[PDB]
Amino acid sequence: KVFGRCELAAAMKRHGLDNYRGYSLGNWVCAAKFESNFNTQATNRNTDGSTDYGILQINSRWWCNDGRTPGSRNLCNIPCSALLSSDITASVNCAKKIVSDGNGMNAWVAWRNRCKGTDVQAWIRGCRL
Numbered sequence: 425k426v427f428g429r430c431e432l433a434a435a436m437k438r439h440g441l442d443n444y445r446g447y448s449l450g451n452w453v454c455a456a457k458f459e460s461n462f463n464t465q466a467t468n469r470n471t472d473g474s475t476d477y478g479i480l481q482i483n484s485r486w487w488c489n490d491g492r493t494p495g496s497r498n499l500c501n502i503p504c505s506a507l508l509s510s511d512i513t514a515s516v517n518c519a520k521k522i523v524s525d526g527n528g529m530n531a532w533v534a535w536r537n538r539c540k541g542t543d544v545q546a547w548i549r550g551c552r553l
């Protein structure tokens with residue numbers, strides 16, 4: 425599923441991402457944009473053999489099981505395929521655990537390089553929330 429900007433913002437807000445751990449809604453929409461282009465089915469392979477999954481490109485190295493990343497952990501206790509659903513519930517709940525592990529949204533490289541220190545409020549501007 426390819427979300428619309430405002431559509432994703434509303435879904436994220438309904439799942440309690442607005443101001444979660446101090447990160448306003450604009451940060452999450454911005455990260456989703458540059459990680460997956462609002463596409464829930466987005467997958468990308470890393471050099472070490474792990475794969476990033478879904479709207480927020482969650483890594484199989486630590487957070488989900490795809491059965492092909494040897495020596496990896498499953499800290500969100502889910503199959504990686506569940507992160508590709510049109511329902512972002514699984515991706516949101518896992519991201520909450522990720523953003524709480526001490527490093528904040530810095531875990532998302534695209535957020536750190538393209539969202540951090542910008543006007544992220546512009547990503548939810550005009551949206552009915």
Ligand SMILES: [Cl-]
Pocket residue numbers: 481482483522531532
């Ligand atoms: Cl991640």
Ligand SMILES: [Cl-]
Pocket residue numbers: 533534537538
């Ligand atoms: Cl980047």
Ligand code: NA
Pocket residue numbers: 484485486487488489490493496497498
């Ligand atoms: Na894993």
